[PDB]
Structures are given as C-alpha cells and as structure tokens.
C-alpha cells in the first residue's frame, strides 16, 4: 500500500511542577524523531508542554491529517487510565488533578478518524494506573469502524511504564526495544508484536511491564510505506533556524554565532572566537540576558561541550541550550558579552552587544 503523506507528532514531558520529574523522554523523543525521519515521516518533536501547548499541538496535528495520511502520535511522560480512557498529563498539572487538566487519547482518536486517515498509530509510553482523585464518569460517543487504528502501549492496563533510575542518557524500557525494530519493513502490528517478545526477555521489568497492542488494522500497512505522486508549507515554517552571524566588536574581536535544532522547541547556540587581536591576552565569549519567559538558568549556560547543557549535538565554542521556544512572547533578543584584557592594562574591560534572532523553530507559531 501507499500513503498520501506520513506525519508524526512527538511529545516528551519531564519538567513536572507538583509531580515526579522524568529524564528519559528527552532521549526517547530524540531517537524516535531520527528513526521516523529516516522513514520519510515529517516530525514535530516537543518537550515539556503545559496543557495549553499540548492542546494546541494536538489540534494542529489533526488538521494536517487527511484521506490516506499516516498519522503517528508518540507520548512519553506522566499518564493514567480510568474506565478504559487514557490521559496524557502535561508538566503543569496540579496535585491532585482531574481529566480537565489532562488530554484524552480516546478523544483524539475520534478526531483522527474524522479526517478519513489511512493509518492511525498511538505509541503511548506512559503508566496506566488509576487516578483515584478523578471521580468523573466520561460519556463519550462510539468510535467509527475504520479498521486502521493501532495502539502501542508501553505497559498493560493498571501497570506502570519504566525508565532507568536517573542514570544518564538511557532510554525507557519501551524505547530500548522499539528503536531496534522501527525501521523494519513488516506490518506495524507485527513490528509491535516483535517488540513485545524482545521486552519479555528484559529482566529489569518482568511481571511489572509488558507491551500492550490494541489493533483494528486490516490492511498490510507499515511505517516504511512509500508516499505517492500547504501541509509542507506550515510544517516548514516551524523548522526554520536563524542563519549563522558574525559579531564584530569595537576592540576588533570577531565572534561567530551558530544555531542547531535539537527539538522543535529546543535550539542550541554556539559561540566561537574567529578573530582575536594580538594585544588581547585574555577574552571570554559570554552570552547573557535571555527572555525571562524562556527561563534560562545561568548555571546551565555557556558550557565547553553540548553534553553539559543537555544536548545531543555533533572548535573551542561555548554551548547554550535554549528550551521552551514556544513560551516566547516577543522576539529572541540576547546580549553577547565580552570580558577582555590587554597586554599592558591591569583591569578587564566590558563590551556588550544585542542580537535579534526573531522567532526560531516553533516560536514562529506565536500563541
């Protein structure tokens, strides 16, 4: 079979306010994004979204879906299952919380079908235990018989989904298996079946985590299926990075500013000193004063390597990881500081400069 298009929305939540924080959805979303891109999928990958931001991204993803389109949703983060309904808990959920604070997977499925899609996939990598505080009973409409829905659950109903206890850049249990299977040219249902068998050999989560697959899919569809023959225009607008610039300073210092796309809402900036006058015996390329709405801790800014900022990027530059680009109200303006000293002079000299990069990556969808 063929797909009209292959689009995917990926959300990874970790930065919970009143709930325990996670580490692995960063790696999980990052890895699944690369694997889906290899499979011709157009991916939008978001980290730590609040209820409003999850609702806006889900809604716009549904609008992009259409007759014959392969839609894939991935969620890694906090979740619960009550009376057969799965809920995705956003980072801004209160403790305790109810269904009005969360997003209903079952409700999203209804909307996916309305756009007459060819294949619908929900890889929900979350816990499925009861949220006893939520005492509401949900009266929802009966889904249409479409025979094209595949549900990849990381755990069974009433059980938890696991990741390794805060130990570096390791994936969660679901992703540890799914990544070495995803690119296979077999039916999406059979590929998930193999993932269940691999998982059932892991010792860490025996009797605590098993993969649940719920499918209605009749046609032999796969994520590898080719594309035949407005969506691309709107999707390209959310993946634009500011171009490399040169900061020539008063004392003759030429700095280089590079930009990289880590996630759809995460961008890395890297400063390199490309020209240093011979009388400047000491100089530091700082990057200070970022929008307060982004929330950039100076203890995490300007690191020798991308790794000490939380990045997965590929000379003598400092890295700064700018997360929450979707929280930008105004344009991205920041200061590039210069702390220099002369061959002779005793005290150090200060030199500022303001840089406007606008609304990078998802920040272009000004909400």
């Amino acid at each position: 079979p063929l797909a009209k298009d292959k689009v995917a929305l990926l959300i990874g939540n970790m930065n919970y306010r009143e709930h325990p924080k996670l580490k692995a959805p960063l790696v999980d979303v990052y890895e699944l994004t690369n694997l889906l891109r290899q499979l011709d999928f157009k991916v939008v990958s978001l980290l730590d979204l609040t209820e409003y931001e999850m609702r806006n991204a889900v809604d716009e993803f549904l609008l992009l879906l259409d007759k014959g389109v392969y839609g894939l949703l991935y969620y890694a983060g906090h979740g619960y299952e009550n009376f057969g309904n799965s809920f995705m808990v956003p980072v801004d959920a209160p403790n305790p919380y109810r269904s009005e604070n969360c997003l209903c997977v079952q409700n999203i499925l209804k909307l996916m079908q309305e756009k007459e899609t060819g294949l619908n996939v929900f890889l929900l990598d979350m816990c499925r235990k009861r949220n006893d505080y939520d005492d509401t009973i949900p009266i929802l409409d009966a889904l249409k018989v479409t025979a094209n829905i595949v549900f990849g659950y990381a755990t069974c109903q009433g059980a938890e989904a696991f990741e390794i206890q805060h130990s570096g850049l390791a994936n969660g249990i679901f992703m540890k298996f799914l990544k070495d299977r995803l690119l296979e040219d077999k039916k999406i249902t059979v590929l998930l079946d193999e993932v269940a068998e691999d998982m059932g050999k892991c010792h860490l989560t025996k009797g605590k985590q098993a993969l649940e697959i719920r499918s209605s899919l009749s046609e032999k569809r796969a994520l590898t299926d080719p594309i035949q023959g407005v969506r691309n225009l709107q999707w390209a607008k959310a993946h634009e990075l500011p171009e490399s610039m040169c900061l020539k300073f008063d004392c003759g210092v030429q700095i280089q500013l590079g930009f990289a796309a880590e996630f759809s809402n995460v961008m890395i900036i890297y400063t390199s000193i490309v020209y240093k006058p011979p009388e400047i015996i000491m100089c530091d390329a700082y990057v200070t004063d970022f929008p307060l709405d982004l929330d950039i801790d100076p203890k995490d800014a300007n690191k020798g390597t991308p790794e000490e900022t939380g990045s997965y990027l590929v000379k003598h530059c400092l890295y700064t990881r700018l997360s929450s680009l979707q929280k930008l109200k105004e344009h991205l303006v920041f200061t590039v500081c210069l702390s220099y000293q002369y061959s002779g002079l005793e005290d150090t000299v200060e030199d500022k400069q303001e840089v406007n990069v606008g609304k990078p990556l998802i920040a272009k969808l000004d909400m």
Binding site: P20, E160, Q165, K208
Partner: peptide
Amino acid sequence: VRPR
C-alpha cells in the same frame, strides 16, 4: 527503575 523510575516509573512514569
């Protein structure tokens, strides 16, 4: 294992 941290659950999620």
